[PDB]
Design a protein around this ligand. Sequence first.
Ligand SMILES: Nc1nc2cc(CN3C(=O)c4cc(F)ccc4[C@]34CCN(Cc3ccc(F)cc3)C4=O)[nH]c2cc1F
Ligand SMILES: Nc1nc2cc(CN3C(=O)c4cc(F)ccc4[C@]34CCN(Cc3ccc(F)cc3)C4=O)[nH]c2cc1F
Ligand SMILES: CSC[C@H]1O[C@@H](n2cnc3c(N)ncnc32)[C@H](O)[C@@H]1O
Ligand SMILES: CSC[C@H]1O[C@@H](n2cnc3c(N)ncnc32)[C@H](O)[C@@H]1O
Lengths: 625, 625
Amino acid sequence: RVSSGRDLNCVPEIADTLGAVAKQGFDFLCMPVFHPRFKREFIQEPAKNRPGPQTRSDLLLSGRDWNTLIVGKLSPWIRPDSKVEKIRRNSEAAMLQELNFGAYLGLPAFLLPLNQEDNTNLARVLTNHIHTGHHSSMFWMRVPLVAPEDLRDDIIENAPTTHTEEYSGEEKTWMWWHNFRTLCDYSKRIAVALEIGADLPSNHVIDRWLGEPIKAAILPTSIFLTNKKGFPVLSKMHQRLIFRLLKLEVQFIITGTNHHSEKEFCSYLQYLEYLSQNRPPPNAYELFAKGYEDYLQSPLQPLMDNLESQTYEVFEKDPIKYSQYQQAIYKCLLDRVPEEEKDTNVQVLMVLGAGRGPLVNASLRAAKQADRRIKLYAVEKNPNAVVTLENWQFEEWGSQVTVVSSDMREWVAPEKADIIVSELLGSFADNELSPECLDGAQHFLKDDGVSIPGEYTSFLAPISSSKLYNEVRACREKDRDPEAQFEMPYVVRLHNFHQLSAPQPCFTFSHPNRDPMIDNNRYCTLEFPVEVNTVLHGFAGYFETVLYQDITLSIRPETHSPGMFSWFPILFPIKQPITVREGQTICVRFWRCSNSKKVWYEWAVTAPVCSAIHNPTGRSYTIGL
Amino acid sequence: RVSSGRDLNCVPEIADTLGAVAKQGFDFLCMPVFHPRFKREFIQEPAKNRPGPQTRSDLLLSGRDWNTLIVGKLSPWIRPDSKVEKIRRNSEAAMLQELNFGAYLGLPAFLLPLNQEDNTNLARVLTNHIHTGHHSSMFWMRVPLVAPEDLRDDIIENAPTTHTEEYSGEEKTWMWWHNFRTLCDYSKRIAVALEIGADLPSNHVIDRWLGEPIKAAILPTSIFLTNKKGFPVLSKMHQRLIFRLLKLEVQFIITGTNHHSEKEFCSYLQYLEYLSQNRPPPNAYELFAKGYEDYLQSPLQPLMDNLESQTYEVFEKDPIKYSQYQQAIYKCLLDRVPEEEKDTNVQVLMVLGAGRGPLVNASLRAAKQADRRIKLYAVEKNPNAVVTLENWQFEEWGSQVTVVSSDMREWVAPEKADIIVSELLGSFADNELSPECLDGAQHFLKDDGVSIPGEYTSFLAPISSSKLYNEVRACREKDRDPEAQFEMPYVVRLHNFHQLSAPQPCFTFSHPNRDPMIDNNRYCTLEFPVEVNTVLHGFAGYFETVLYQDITLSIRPETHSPGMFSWFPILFPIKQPITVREGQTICVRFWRCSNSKKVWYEWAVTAPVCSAIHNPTGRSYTIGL
Ligand SMILES: Nc1nc2cc(CN3C(=O)c4cc(F)ccc4[C@]34CCN(Cc3ccc(F)cc3)C4=O)[nH]c2cc1F
Ligand SMILES: Nc1nc2cc(CN3C(=O)c4cc(F)ccc4[C@]34CCN(Cc3ccc(F)cc3)C4=O)[nH]c2cc1F
Ligand SMILES: CSC[C@H]1O[C@@H](n2cnc3c(N)ncnc32)[C@H](O)[C@@H]1O
Ligand SMILES: CSC[C@H]1O[C@@H](n2cnc3c(N)ncnc32)[C@H](O)[C@@H]1O
């Protein structure tokens, strides 16, 4: 179930080592490429002219074994940021040599340590190696939760351990990582191998690593407790951490000697398996979502574009949404039509944007459970979908449903509606121009008519995700602005991220709109109180909608409709990441803009520092009218 | 084995039709999306306001069935290039409607006919559809080998069939295709469905379709002969054509009614299977090559770059090459050392570019079968490979082999060589700068010393491939010249192409070079007599090398070393395709250029029309010294 490997810093025979490791159930082996103690000179004679082979032959394993089962390790003596000029220069040449040999073997990953603050020259050498030739080899940066200096035993007489609560000081290992990856300019080849300590730090220190590219989680043998049976286990603190790490789907590495000598070394791995099996299973949401983790997709525009058959199919495969629509209409029928006017009053319903007709069906079910008479129209502009409607209408529905093949803004209605039902909402509610469409369809609603939905609101929340930022970055395309990708929203299942503040309402719309000279342009200022140090990369967008009264749909995490999976969150990126100290307020500004042809959003951060205004004049992103 | 489908222009029940087709062993079904006879008006009333559904519902099949098993067909009444303005306008609207519905269903392919010369407005509408939205749906252009007018029965009294040999006139259906795809600007979505006739045309007419994107081969039932048993078969003419088509791996479509009424419809398909099984099986070359058909790869530069382990591995997995090297050295030892000086004379061999040491081994085998004494050096600049050499040398070889870790141009030799052995040849021979390296290593050769190889030559041949041209086109990258991809050679297994003329020698090099002030710059004019109409897209490059005397290696098709698969051909593209009439000479000019840092090629076509000079000053492509 769980993908696990073994860290060793001693390999006397490479073939024999693997065999043992593989027999214990490990998937891969982290090991040195040159002997850890084999220190090499590159400048001063005569040690530079040392004869003989420098390491093992590549022939000792097959090409496939190198490619899948081995993870390289930088030798410990290599210190590129040494104060001594000689050791620096030597460590440079040695680092390149080891990294080059790693690429020669075609290793999938290679471990480098972050065990101090200044890793500038380390970063400069690695970056150079990345920009030499072509390779897909990952680089896992070995970085501890807690720095070695901060978890040392208080046993030095004239140098006691810091007994002071230093909020910023306990987050230092993240700052080590942050600076390194910034210098390297957010390379997608550079990821984190997070080393877990005996004493876990405060909760904030761990939350720091949310939204970071964690590929490995190194577990020492020392941190394992022993149970009554006499086999390795972990604390309830560590258990909760491993449970969190299993959601990220990281690869767990075991390092250190067998402290549980009486038992096998498989026991450690068997415990991780034990934890893997013993987790809360994936719900309908996470079942379906499994696959689209942090996958950027362009927001659908069913007005500008005509949706495909299989796009409508996946909409229809959400029974919770339509049951809510069914219930919404059901109640509205009872309110508008009394019991004494059951078979006198026929309500005029108008599904605006009928698609392949899930609402038409729902409206039929709603009328039957209510036991009230209805007259249905099914307005749909997409002519490909209208083919589906008419075939259904001929076979199943009949003359009760009148299929109209038109835009709702254009259509001249032969009758006014008591209810209009729509499904024109995207992940940011109004991103499919539901306001404009329903405004244009408003004239053929009765003066006392109802709209379903009657209201919808969009929400925003600041997020830190070095993953998603790096994902957007990689959406640069030929023949357009170099930074166009940052000035456009994405539909994405947000997974590896950190929500820095609680969602707040952005834009609200009410139908039918009764405000004279109806304007759908907006400008919203939001202030998000941050309680942690972090780096803002964008703003996650959600929405809520009121169908009728107490009938609602929502993708806002705290009020999320259970089971529903018809809308993933939306992501508004920013060009440049913005550092945010604990106590500081993130201030974002959002505009909804329009002309006769297009609608778009612009946005800007104004605190703690200013960003550029994103998507001015909809240059990078527009929504078609 | 063979991928086959069924063409129908009559589908009364879509579900039942598939069942029958699937039971007969067909993989997919070509069918209409709207009823062939269902002609629709879009302008004039009242026919434009025709009620009811326009076609079948998408719900009759599953999404997956549409995506894999159905191929769309444009209705026959749709004529976008009609002389009548009304029929034109109507056919435009209808064409878009059908194409849009095809995309709605998510069909993998869609058939459009090329049954006349002028298909300009057809091309204009299709191109518009391609540039509307995003889809991966292919478009198969139905084009006959022989035009309907040219295969009609000579049964009209006052209009007899052309009994004249019109060389250009019999190639007209290709010109139909050529013009169409040119208008559409070589879209990768547009391919050919070649319709085979009863009487096959002349051989030249068929050769015209070499290097064209043929995805389907439509076979009417009428063209099938009947055997003594009373089941469908094909002529020896058609058999050879199908054998050629099986190499291209096209999908065979069966069209028309069952003329063999007594037998099943599976019999037709079973015959294609019968042919599929009964072909000459793939040799060692085609066995290994299967996968890299028309796959563009960048030429290796083992001087500038350090080759990976698995790059050396695949070199070593060619036993024919080294057996030739073994035999080459074997003979040279016997010539240089007589029988009476068997154990007096030790020959000094020097493998220049030893890699992981296949030649060192071969030199050992060659000396043993010859029974002569040798002293080996193993010069290698790549330090990663030197690790392999030294481990081998320690374990196996010993002090007979002296591993040197240096550039051969730099290395100060402590002894002069009787033989130097090298493996510095690429697909265009001198594209790895074997001339420069061996010139720089020439000083430590004895005055009577031998070089293996002693000579090598590069060859060029003009090719027509609309596939490969379109492949290169798609190698456009951000942040460089828009046409850089055309000014650089590619290593590629040439498959779907047409060789327009016989290869001719381009550049030759002899080692040891004894010409004062050795210049490796060159300028070569070649004239290629073409005997067919075609469109030049590039120049395939090959090479021959003389190891010693009668010991040679070659990838030139006519003199190709049997079994060897260590070099695929190289491809020099051109920016713009060049039309070439039968009888015309293709004149190409090739330069080998250099400065102190780089070596590169430039090239230009000078007849029948001039091209631009490609890669001036090595702007787009250089080979590193
Ligand atoms: N009018 C409507 N608009 C909308 C707008 C949406 C959201 N949406 C996109 O914008 C979008 C853009 C894309 F490129 C791809 C997919 C989407 C979705 C639709 C489905 N889906 C969830 C999902 C996808 C995959 C999955 F394995 C599980 C769940 C989204 O995120 N759903 C509507 C339903 C309506 F009726
Ligand atoms: N010094 C040498 N140079 C050379 C130069 C070559 C040719 N070459 C490339 O340039 C090249 C460039 C690439 F991106 C990828 C591959 C190649 C090859 C090497 C192997 N191969 C054949 C093949 C590949 C794959 C296959 F499934 C079957 C056969 C080529 O075409 N082979 C040498 C061997 C030497 F000893
Ligand atoms: C069921 S998803 C929403 C549906 O509304 C349709 N739609 C969107 N805008 C309009 C409009 N202005 N008039 C009619 N249908 C519309 C879309 O084509 C889609 O089928
Ligand atoms: C076996 S493929 C050719 C080999 O020659 C080596 N080589 C290429 N140019 C030189 C050079 N100038 N000096 C030494 N080895 C070389 C390459 O590193 C490769 O291993």
